[PDB]
Design an enzyme around this catalytic site. Structure first.
Site, short mmCIF file in Angstrom:
data_model
loop_
_atom_site.label_atom_id
_atom_site.label_comp_id
_atom_site.label_asym_id
_atom_site.label_seq_id
_atom_site.Cartn_x
_atom_site.Cartn_y
_atom_site.Cartn_z
N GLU A 209 2.64 1.48 3.57
CA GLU A 209 2.11 1.25 2.23
C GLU A 209 2.27 -0.22 1.89
OE1 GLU A 209 1.96 4.72 1.12
OE2 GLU A 209 0.38 4.29 -0.32
N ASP A 218 -6.75 -0.60 -2.73
CA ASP A 218 -6.51 0.24 -1.55
C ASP A 218 -7.80 0.41 -0.75
OD1 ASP A 218 -6.43 3.68 -2.90
OD2 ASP A 218 -7.84 2.04 -3.21
#
Ligand SMILES: CC(C)CCC[C@@H](C)[C@H]1CC[C@H]2[C@@H]3CC=C4C[C@@H](O)CC[C@]4(C)[C@H]3CC[C@]12C
Ligand SMILES: CC(C)CCC[C@@H](C)[C@H]1CC[C@H]2[C@@H]3CC=C4C[C@@H](O)CC[C@]4(C)[C@H]3CC[C@]12C
Ligand SMILES: CCCCCCCC/C=C/CCCCCCCC(=O)OC[C@@H](O)CO
Ligand SMILES: CCOC(=O)c1oc2cccc(OC[C@@H](O)CNC(C)C)c2c1C
Length: 439
Positions: A209, A218
């Protein structure tokens, strides 16, 4: 052809000095690198610098001239300095090994229990004590053999072969090399074990992440911050700024500190877990699972939410039934595998093996521990042959040739140059090297 050796040996001295003065100055000038571990690395680099400046050159002259040119005093001192640098290195490596064990087992994972001042003292003791054990037995002549070939080399100013008696040979080798070596291999393999055991869901999600402190997008294009904390599905940066300010409780301007991101992550993992026990389908599976496979399940719900993860009905049926390879096949048959694979493959493997094998050396602090291990591993490989063959010469004395002995010593010498290269694995050390090399 003897010219060849001369060039080869000159290039070696330079690399040892160049490399090590670099490492020394990188730490001395840059604060981000003024840490306890890098204090011990300074002790290490110092030893390899004295090796390159004071030791190797007079080793090359000795070989190329087939005689000693520098008299008896420097013959003695050259030996005492040489031994000191090797001893002070290995004990420093043993200390690094020990310090990393106490760090990884303490709640303050990855940070030394020692203070900078405390570290300065340990180094000074290592050097003083090593300085005793190296110089003292040599100035006091306790090392000396009594057979004719040896006593001749002593009375002869132009001879400086390292002849010792078998007692000192054993005593010096054990205390100088073997003891800190065997402790270091045992202790550091145990630090590797602790890193892997102590792996948890927080580090797992930190690996796949990242951490970004300014607003990013993202792979779906949704606005994100911190450790994968989604701000809004909306495509308006002001809405994303609006959500951040509410989630932190202050005017942020789309930027946060490492302290602020950590508690969002802590709320997010809480939420994904709280979601798991709230959901009808996810609840049972979780209970059946070991602490490791549990973490993989949380990982997914972090990425997709409970509703989405509960959609893997086929796969969830089998993780509950402990059918590991059958679930892994059904998780690969997914949009999730398709959307992002570098991350999914790891998660699935975790569900498959029940081990952290997919996450080995992925964390920055773990990559940092591997480097140290590579230093240790290399030092062992380079010196061990010499020291093994040293002690085999004490038992059956007519088995190892002077040519073989000197050569195995030089495999040792060349180790003084490998560290600076190995340190190029450290991003902190790279940025430091290029700033200093003006690049
Ligand atoms: C006998 C000769 C040939 C070699 C001796 C070299 C001595 C002077 C060197 C080698 C390694 C050095 C140490 C290595 C780095 C530490 C940490 C640093 O933050 C302060 C200095 C300190 C404590 C150094 C003091 C001086 C030191 C002990
Ligand atoms: C025989 C010859 C090679 C000996 C020469 C002595 C050299 C190697 C010693 C003597 C004093 C030492 C320094 C004393 C303390 C400083 C400050 C510290 O922050 C980094 C190490 C550093 C920079 C040491 C490096 C090694 C040093 C320069
Ligand atoms: C094949 C291997 C060959 C290796 C080739 C390298 C040899 C070059 C010469 C080195 C002498 C030592 C010079 C010391 C290093 C200078 C770099 C440095 O430390 O810079 C700090 C300075 O920028 C502070 O502001
Ligand atoms: C002959 C018996 O050997 C030892 O007792 C011994 O113990 C040691 C402990 C630490 C370091 C040591 O030096 C490694 C070499 O670079 C020394 N360079 C030679 C030319 C003297 C030694 C040695 C040589």
């Amino acid at each position: 052809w003897v010219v060849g050796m001369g060039i080869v040996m000159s290039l070696i001295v330079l690399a040892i000095v160049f490399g090590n003065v670099l490492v020394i100055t990188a730490i001395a000038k840059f604060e981000r690198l003024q840490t306890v571990t890098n204090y011990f690395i300074t002790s290490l680099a110092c030893a390899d610098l004295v090796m390159g400046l004071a030791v190797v050159p007079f080793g090359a002259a000795h070989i190329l001239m087939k005689m000693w040119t520098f008299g008896n005093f420097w013959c003695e001192f050259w030996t005492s300095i040489d031994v000191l640098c090797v001893t002070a290195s290995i004990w420093t490596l043993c200390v690094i090994a020990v310090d990393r064990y106490f760090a990884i087992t303490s709640p303050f994972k990855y940070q030394s229990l020692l203070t900078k001042n405390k570290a300065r003292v340990i180094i000074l003791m290592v050097w003083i004590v090593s300085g005793l054990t190296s110089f003292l037995p040599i100035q006091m002549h306790w090392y000396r053999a009594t057979h004719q070939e040896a006593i001749n080399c002593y009375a002869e100013e132009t001879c400086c072969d390292f002849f010792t008696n078998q007692a000192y040979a054993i005593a010096s080798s054990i205390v100088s090399f073997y003891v800190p070596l065997v402790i270091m291999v045992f202790v550091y393999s145990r630090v590797f074990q602790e890193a892997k055991r102590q792996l948890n869901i927080f580090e797992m999600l930190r690996i796949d992440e990242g951490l970004r402190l300014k607003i990013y997008k993202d792979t779906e294009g949704y606005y994100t911050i911190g450790i994968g904390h989604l701000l809004t599905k909306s495509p308006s940066l002001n809405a994303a700024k609006s959500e951040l300010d509410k989630a932190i409780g202050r005017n942020t301007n789309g930027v946060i500190t490492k302290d602020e991101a950590e508690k969002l992550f802590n709320q997010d993992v809480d939420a994904a877990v709280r979601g798991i026990l709230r959901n009808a389908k996810l609840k049972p599976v979780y209970d059946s699972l070991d602490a490791v496979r549990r973490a993989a399940l949380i990982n997914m719900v972090f990425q997709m939410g409970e509703t989405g993860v509960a959609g893997f009905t086929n796969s969830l049926r089998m993780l509950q039934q402990k059918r590991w390879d059958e679930a892994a096949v059904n998780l690969a048959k997914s949009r999730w595998y398709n959307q992002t694979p570098n991350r999914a493959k790891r998660v699935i493997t975790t569900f498959r093996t029940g081990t952290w094998d997919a996450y080995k050396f992925c964390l920055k602090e773990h990559k940092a521990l591997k480097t140290l291990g590579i230093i240790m591993g290399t030092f062992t490989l380079c010196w061990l042959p010499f020291f093994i063959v040293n002690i085999v010469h004490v038992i059956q004395d007519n088995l190892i040739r002077k040519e073989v002995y000197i050569l195995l010593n030089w495999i040792g010498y060349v180790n003084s140059g490998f560290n600076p290269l190995i340190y190029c694995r450290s991003p902190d050390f790279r940025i430091a090297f290029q700033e200093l090399l003006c690049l």
